[PDB]
Structure formats: C-alpha cells, structure tokens
Amino acid sequence: GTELDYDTFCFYYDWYGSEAIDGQYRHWAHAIAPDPNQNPGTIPGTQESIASNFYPQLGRYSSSDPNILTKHMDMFVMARTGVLALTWWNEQDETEAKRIGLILDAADKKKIKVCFHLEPYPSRNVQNLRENIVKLITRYGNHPAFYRKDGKPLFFIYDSYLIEPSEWEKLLSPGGSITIRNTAYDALMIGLWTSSPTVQRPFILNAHFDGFYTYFAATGFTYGSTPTNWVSMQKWAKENGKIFIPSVGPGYIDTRIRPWNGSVIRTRTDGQYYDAMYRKAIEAGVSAISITSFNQWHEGSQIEPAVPYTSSEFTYLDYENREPDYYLTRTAYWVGKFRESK
C-alpha cells in the first residue's frame, strides 16, 4: 500500500546554500544565461528575487542543513520514491564530501537509497570517470544507503554523447583496456538517449551502456523525451538486453535564468501534464522510471512543495489550485499504478 519503490529514481540537486549553514544563498543567486543566438546580469538570491519561476515552501534553504535534509527524506517517503539520484560535479572540496555524507545518513534513517548522476564536469573522459567511479565506490560503497541492483551500483551519465563510443568501449566492453566489467568496480551504466534511433541505437550498442534514460521533463525537447516514442524504445531495449528508464516530470519553465528559452515551457495544468507523462511510461511496460525532478527549481521541474509568493521584483508561479504537497501525493499514486504493472 505505502512501501517505497526501489525501481523509481528521483533526480536530486544538493547545490543550494543558506546564511544559516553556508553563510551565503548559493544557487538562489544565479547568473542569467546569455542568448545562444551581451552582459546579461545576475539574479541576486534575495528574499524577493530568487533563481526560479516558483518559490519553495522551505524558503532559501541549504542542502547542507541536516534539518532540511530530514524534511526532504520525509517528502521522498510521502512520494514512495525509493532512490535519490544525486547530482555529482567532481568539485573536490570539503563541502561536497560533507554534503554527500549528510545525505547518505539522512536517507538511511527512512530506508531511502542513493545513486550518483555523473555530470559533465571539466575535461570529463573515460580515465578520470573510472578513477571517480572507483573513489565513489571505495568511499561510500559500504554505507547502508548506497544503492545496488543485483550487487551492482548504478550511475546515470548526463550528456554521455559528449564522449565517443570508441572511448566508452575502453571502460564498458568486457575486453576494454580499462574495463570495469568483471572487476570489484563493475556497475550499471545508464547513458542519455537524445536524438533519432538511426544515431542512438548504434551509439548505445557500441558504447556498451547497460541501459538508457531520457532526462528532460519537457515533452518534445528531444526524440527521447517525446513519450509517443517510448513503446518502440522499450521494444528495442528488451531485444538488445538493455534497461530503459524513461524520465517523467510535472512541467518545465526556466525563463528567470534563461529569458530567451520560452519555447521549452510546458504548463502544469493542475497535474494533468504529469499524469500524461507518467501514464505513457507505465504503458510502455518499462521495469524502472526516473523523475525529473525533486528540486531543480531553476528549470521549474520540481515536485518539492512550492507556495504562493509576490514581490515588486517578481510574481511567482505556484501549485494552485492544488495544495503545496500535491506533486508528492500524485507521485505516490503513480508509483502504485507502476507497481501493479510490474
């Protein structure tokens, strides 16, 4: 009825600061991105003006605040989401190491598991990826909240297409020069499916990924994030021994930090958009689902509770006519439907 689902992975961001913990409102303050097609300015992260079109129920919180982390784990329990997929940027700073330890300890108190979402950090390549996979498994592999499926850790790899299949083969083929296959550091490696099947099918096969995900909460942003393609993507995956983990989300809007990106807006329609994405994932017959996102406030994809808020700087969007915790409860509903279908 209410147990956590360990085939549901929710993308989680630990880059927020507060004056209480960090001494600064990190990420609530954020540079405005220049138009790809310029002195754009910065959102200052004051109470009135934050880097989101929405406004958190918990305010300008710190991701290093143990009291905030506790409340977040309670929110995961409400949503029935059993795995927290943690953004990881290879910052190599004491604050990063501290935050990962706090998140693991908080998660374990509510039986939530943690896996890593490997980001496009500077000069990312298959050698430093191996070195960082080994570090992460050695440092956190014995923590009880560290996620495993059939004895293997799992990693999502954002913008995996930035590395050529001839490089991925070295790490992920059983014969690869620096392979993790059949070693103590073997893992499930889930790459990002973006574009058409004529490009993606050979990429995934040649790179030796164990599976693929789609990430984007905005329908139609890519081929992969267009749900009418998911039945055929699942059929191809099952035929080729690959795990398909489609990404579902409640909406998208990023125009505070990207004022030129309005065409990517997807409206929430009081939950109906989320319902349509989640239904299509379940209908495709997949064995795992990813949620974009718990708390990407910059991109307006969050299921974390939000509240009404107005200032002279900006009038924020909010969840009305639904209540602030609607997207947590609606997640729990769809987790129930997914479990019926497995």
Ligand X SMILES: OC[C@H]1O[C@H](O[C@@H]2[C@H](O)[C@@H](O)O[C@H](CO)[C@H]2O)[C@@H](O)[C@@H](O)[C@@H]1O
Ligand Y SMILES: OC[C@H]1O[C@H](O[C@H]2[C@@H](O)[C@H](O)[C@@H](CO)O[C@@H]2O)[C@@H](O)[C@@H](O)[C@@H]1O
Residues 316-335 that bind ligand X (CB under 6 A): none
222 part of the interface to ligand Y, by CB under 6 A: yes
Q: Which is nearer to Na ion, 104 or 163 (CB)?
A: 104
What's the start-to-end Cα distance of the chain, in Å?
15
Residue 23 CB, shortest distance to Na ion, in Å, is 38
318 part of the interface to Na ion, by CB under 5 A: no
Residue 257 CB, shortest distance to ligand X, in Å, is 6
Work out which of 95, 261, 287, 329 binds ligand Y, going by CB under 6 A.
Answer: 261
- The whole-angstrom separation of Cα 12 and Cα 116 is 10
- The whole-angstrom separation of Cα 159 and Cα 191 is 8
Work out which of 26, 99, 130, 298 binds ligand X, going by CB under 6 A.
Answer: 298
Q: Which is nearer to ligand Y, 173 or 226 (CB)?
A: 226
Q: Which is nearer to ligand Y, 211 or 224 (CB)?
A: 224
Residue 291 CB, shortest distance to ligand X, in Å, is 12
User: Do residues 281 and 288 touch, judged by C-beta distance below 8 A?
Assistant: no
C-alpha neighbours within 13 Å on the C-beta side of residue 166:
0
226 part of the interface to ligand Y, by CB under 6 A: no
Residue 248 CB, shortest distance to ligand Y, in Å, is 15
Bridge partners of 86, per DSSP, are 12, 116
295 part of the interface to ligand Y, by CB under 6 A: no
Closest to 9 in 3D by CA, of 83, 66, 97, 99: 83
119 part of the interface to ligand Y, by CB under 6 A: no
108 part of the interface to ligand Y, by CB under 6 A: no
Residues 184-213 that bind Na ion (CB under 5 A): none
158 part of the interface to ligand X, by CB under 6 A: yes
Phi/psi for 226 (5° steps) reads -100, 105
Residues 151-170 that bind ligand Y (CB under 6 A): 159
Q: How far from 340 is each of 1, 5, 149, CA to CA, in Å?
A: 11, 12, 20
292 part of the interface to ligand Y, by CB under 6 A: no
Residue 194, contacted partner among ligand X, Na ion, ligand Y, none, CB below 5-8 A by kind: ligand Y
R_g (Cα) of the chain, nearest Å: 19
- The whole-angstrom separation of Cα 225 and Cα 216 is 6
Work out which of 7, 22, 108, 119 binds ligand X, going by CB under 6 A.
Answer: 119
Q: Using N-to-C axis directions, what is the helix angle for 197-207 and 165-172, rounded to 10°?
A: 30
Q: How far from 158 is each of 112, 231, 277, 331, CA to CA, in Å?
A: 22, 23, 21, 23
264 part of the interface to ligand Y, by CB under 6 A: yes
96 part of the interface to ligand X, by CB under 6 A: no
DSSP-assigned states of every residue in 288-299:
-EEES-SS-TTT
Bridge partners of 67, per DSSP, are none
What six digits make up the tokens of 114? 């943690």
301 part of the interface to ligand Y, by CB under 6 A: no
Residues that bind Na ion (CB under 5 A): 6-7, 149
Residues that bind ligand X (CB under 6 A): 87, 117, 119, 158, 257, 296, 298-299
Residues that bind ligand Y (CB under 6 A): 159, 194, 216, 222, 261, 264, 299
